[PDB]
């Protein structure tokens, strides 16, 4: 159809909108008087879905106050109308369609945001009722809208969350309603809001969200969830929780919500979620800000949980990934721990004639070998690239880095840092053991030292500048007393 067909439609809607509003004001409890215009409005709304197909003429909608009318209509006293509008809004903003016309799309988006679209969607949700199939579908379309908007443009997630979305999502997740498709959807949307968005992580924390997250996870601590969809939800929740843990402010909250105990329990009871519960543990401990958590871990016998996992790797989660988190956690513990807990941790490295140390060195040799092979492969790639005429650029460099990471760079680094910290503790047995074994193959003290220097260069991206010198300093301190 043509902009002759379309331009009609909008203004028709406006008339039908305005008229319906007027009539509804005039006869607040005489249904008879507004009803046929109610139907007229509904029909015109349904017919609009058409417009999605023409992505540019979106610019038009804005101009003739269509958008604004729509936004108002999510407040319309009759849920049948608002659901219909929601559906229309979801069709308009279906992401494939948007990537047809970025100009029509862009201005529509701008209009939508400027109107507090998310806030009005949430208001609508607050009065929807899911025991009624069309309403429940309204919720789903609502969520779909925000998923579409996030995909088209990130910056707004911060504003949207504060516009009551995040809080509603939390309420929905804690709601005592059987798991259903909406809940799953909620779980992914929350995760989408939370990646890279610290004000939302913070906001979640303030909203007491950490508790909520832990309780849902609580649910499947001993048993697995009923269906594949519910397990995907769990994974979603886990992701969200890890995101939240990137913010320092949230480590305290985790601690006081007994997050640590829970994850420990999960690790002991060998659920599939355990692969994730290891990740969570890792996140909960990484930086200086994971110091209290590190100590509490030891207090609750985390050591007994973690060391068996260190000694043996059980086989979605691969062997490498499993080792990675464990070693990372150990690294964090060696960094942050102090006093009795630290002493206890070191005792593990002495025990059974430093079997842990023998483990460590075994791991080292495993990952090192891999690393060597990958780096050789990368060398060969370079040479061939030169021969052909292909220029090594940023994309080729990132691809190489990914390949290296796959081979276990981070875990290697972690191992080596453990080795270093261990040796720096005044324990002859340990140093002897390390040096014994290196010289048992010869290969070697400098290698480790090189590896540690590489690690020191890089991390952190990072949080503070002054911090980053000091950390490098302390790492290098470990290299002399080796």
Q: Tell the burial category of 410 from Cβ atoms under 10 Å away from its Cβ (0-12, 13-18, 19+).
A: middle
Distance, in Å, from the CA atom of 394 to the CA atom of 398, rounded to the nearest integer, reads 6
Cis? peptide before 460, omega within 30° of 0: yes
Q: Where are the beta strands (DSSP E) in 349-424?
A: none
Distance, in Å, from the CA atom of 356 to the CA atom of 331, rounded to the nearest integer, reads 14
Residue 202: how many CA atoms within 13 Å on its side-chain side? 8
Residue with tokens 């100590």, as numbered in its chain? 295
From residue 127, give the alpha-carbon distance in Å to each of 18, 85, 121. 23, 15, 10
Distance, in Å, from the CA atom of 205 to the CA atom of 218, rounded to the nearest integer, reads 18
Question: Which resolution in angstroms does this entry have?
Answer: 3.0
**C-beta of residue 412 within 8 angstroms of C-beta of residue 357:** no
- What does the radius of gyration of the chain's CA atoms come to, in whole angstroms? 29
Please give the full DSSP string across 232-260, using - where no structure is assigned. Answer: HHHHHHHHHHHHHHHSTHHHHHHHHTTHH
Distance, in Å, from the CA atom of 481 to the CA atom of 264, rounded to the nearest integer, reads 34
Q: How many other CB atoms are there within 10 angstroms of residue 134's CB atom?
A: 13
**C-beta of residue 428 within 8 angstroms of C-beta of residue 413:** no
- What element of type H or E holds 103? helix 102-114
Residue with tokens 């005792």, as numbered in its chain? 347
Q: CA torsion angle for 445, 446, 451, 454 (degrees, to 10)? A: 150
Q: Tell the burial category of 143 from Cβ atoms under 10 Å away from its Cβ (0-12, 13-18, 19+).
A: buried
Q: How many other CB atoms are there within 10 angstroms of residue 46's CB atom?
A: 12
Residue among 157, 142, 225, 148 nearest 191 (CA): 157
Q: Mark 432-453 as b/e (b = at least 16 C-beta within 10 Å).
A: ebbeebbeeeeeeeeebbebbe
Residue among 377, 364, 361 nearest 412 (CA): 364
Helix axes 340-388, 428-441, angle to 10 degrees: 20
Distance of CA 106 to the CA centre of its chain: 26
Helix axes 259-269, 302-311, angle to 10 degrees: 40
Q: Tell the burial category of 104 from Cβ atoms under 10 Å away from its Cβ (0-12, 13-18, 19+).
A: buried
Residue among 192, 186, 276, 179 nearest 230 (CA): 179
Q: Is the dihedral of CA 192, 196, 200, 204 positive or negative?
A: positive
Distance, in Å, from the CA atom of 108 to the CA atom of 82, rounded to the nearest integer, reads 19
What lies within 8 Å, CB to CB, of 98 at 6+ separation is 55, 105, 109, 148, 152
Distance, in Å, from the CA atom of 238 to the CA atom of 283, rounded to the nearest integer, reads 11
Distance, in Å, from the CA atom of 129 to the CA atom of 256, rounded to the nearest integer, reads 34
CATH for 1-482, options being 1.10.620.20, 1.10.3720.10, 1.25.10.10, 3.30.70.2750: 1.25.10.10
Please give the full DSSP string across 292-317, using - where no structure is assigned. Answer: HHHHHHHHTTHHHHHHHHHH------
Distance of CA 2 to the CA centre of its chain: 43
Name the residue ranges covered by the structural domains of the chain: 1-482
Q: Is the dihedral of CA 80, 84, 89, 94 positive or negative?
A: positive
Distance, in Å, from the CA atom of 3 to the CA atom of 88, rounded to the nearest integer, reads 19
Distance, in Å, from the CA atom of 136 to the CA atom of 355, rounded to the nearest integer, reads 57
Please give the full DSSP string across 150-190, using - where no structure is assigned. Answer: HHH-STTHHHHIIIIIHHHHHHHHHS-S---HHHHHHHHHH
Tell me how far apart the terminal alpha carbons of the chain are, to the nearest angstrom. Answer: 77
Structure tokens at 204: 């979640």
Residue with tokens 């390949």, as numbered in its chain? 403
Distance of CA 97 to the CA centre of its chain: 26
Q: CA torsion angle for 279, 280, 282, 286 (degrees, to 10)? A: 130
Q: After which residues is the chain broken (C to N over 2.5 A)?
A: 315
Q: CA torsion angle for 162, 168, 170, 173 (degrees, to 10)? A: -160
Distance, in Å, from the CA atom of 438 to the CA atom of 420, rounded to the nearest integer, reads 13
Distance, in Å, from the CA atom of 471 to the CA atom of 237, rounded to the nearest integer, reads 33
Residue among 333, 263, 272 nearest 303 (CA): 333
Residue with tokens 């949700």, as numbered in its chain? 125
Residue with tokens 């796959």, as numbered in its chain? 406
**C-beta of residue 49 within 8 angstroms of C-beta of residue 95:** no
Distance, in Å, from the CA atom of 404 to the CA atom of 416, rounded to the nearest integer, reads 16
3-state DSSP of 114-149 = HCCHHHHHHHHHHHCCCCCHHHHHHHHHHHHHHHHH
Q: Where are the beta strands (DSSP E) in 240-281?
A: none
Structure tokens at 154: 């990130």
From residue 28, give the alpha-carbon distance in Å to each of 34, 252, 437. 9, 52, 87
Residue with tokens 């691809």, as numbered in its chain? 399
Helix/strand/coil percent split, the chain, to 5? 80, 0, 20
**C-beta of residue 408 within 8 angstroms of C-beta of residue 374:** no
> Collapsing DSSP states into helix, strand and coil, what is residue 32?
helix
CA angle centred on 225, ends 224 and 228, rounded to 5°: 115
Distance, in Å, from the CA atom of 158 to the CA atom of 198, rounded to the nearest integer, reads 9
């Amino acid at each position: 159809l043509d902009e002759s067909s379309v331009k009609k439609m909008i203004l028709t809607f406006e008339k039908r909108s305005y008229k319906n509003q007027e009539l509804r004001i005039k006869f607040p409890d005489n249904p008879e008087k507004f009803m046929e215009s109610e139907l007229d409005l509904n029909d015109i709304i349904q017919e609009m879905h058409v417009v999605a197909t023409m992505p540019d003429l979106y610019h038009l909608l804005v101009e003739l106050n269509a958008v604004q009318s729509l936004l108002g209509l999510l407040g319309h006293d009759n849920t049948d109308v608002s659901i219909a509008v929601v559906d229309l809004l979801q069709e308009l903003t279906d992401i494939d369609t948007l990537h047809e016309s970025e100009e029509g799309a862009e201005v529509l988006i701008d209009a939508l945001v400027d109107g507090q679209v998310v806030a009005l969607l949430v208001q609508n949700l607050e009065r929807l009722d899911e025991s009624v199939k069309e309403e429940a579908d309204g919720v789903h379309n609502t969520l779909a809208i925000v998923e579409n908007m996030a995909e088209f443009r990130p910056e707004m997630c911060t504003e949207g969350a504060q516009q009551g979305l995040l809080q509603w999502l939390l309420k929905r997740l804690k709601a005592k309603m059987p798991f259903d498709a909406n809940k799953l959807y909620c779980s992914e949307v929350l995760a989408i809001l939370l990646q890279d968005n610290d004000e939302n992580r913070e906001l979640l924390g303030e909203l007491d969200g950490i508790d909520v997250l832990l309780q849902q996870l609580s649910v499947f601590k001993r048993h697995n969830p009923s269906t594949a969809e519910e397990q995907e939800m769990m994974e979603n929740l886990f992701d969200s929780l890890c995101s939240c843990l990137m913010l320092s402010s949230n480590r305290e909250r985790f601690l006081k919500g007994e997050g640590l105990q829970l994850m420990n329990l999960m690790l002991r009871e060998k659920k599939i979620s355990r692969s994730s519960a290891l990740k969570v543990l890792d996140h909960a401990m990484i930086g200086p800000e994971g110091t209290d958590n590190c100590h509490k871990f030891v207090d609750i016998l985390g050591l007994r949980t973690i060391f068996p996992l260190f000694m043996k790797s059980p086989r979605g989660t691969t062997e490498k990934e499993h080792e990675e988190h464990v070693c990372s956690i150990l690294a964090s513990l060696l960094r942050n721990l102090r006093g009795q807990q630290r002493t206890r941790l070191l005792n593990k490295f002495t025990e059974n004639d430093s079997e842990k140390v023998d483990r460590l060195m075994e791991l080292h040799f495993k990952y090192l070998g891999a690393m060597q092979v990958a780096d050789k492969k990368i060398e060969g790639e370079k040479h061939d690239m030169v021969r052909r005429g292909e220029i090594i650029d940023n994309d080729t460099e990132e691809e190489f880095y990914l390949r290296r990471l796959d081979a276990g760079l981070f875990v290697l680094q972690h191992i080596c840092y453990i080795m270093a910290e261990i040796c720096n503790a005044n324990v002859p047995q340990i140093r002897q053991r390390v040096h014994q074994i290196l010289n048992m193959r010869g290969s070697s003290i400098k290698i480790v030292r090189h590896i540690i220097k590489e690690y020191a260069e890089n991390i952190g991206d990072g949080r503070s500048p002054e911090f980053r010198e000091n950390e490098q300093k302390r790492i290098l301190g470990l290299l002399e007393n080796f």
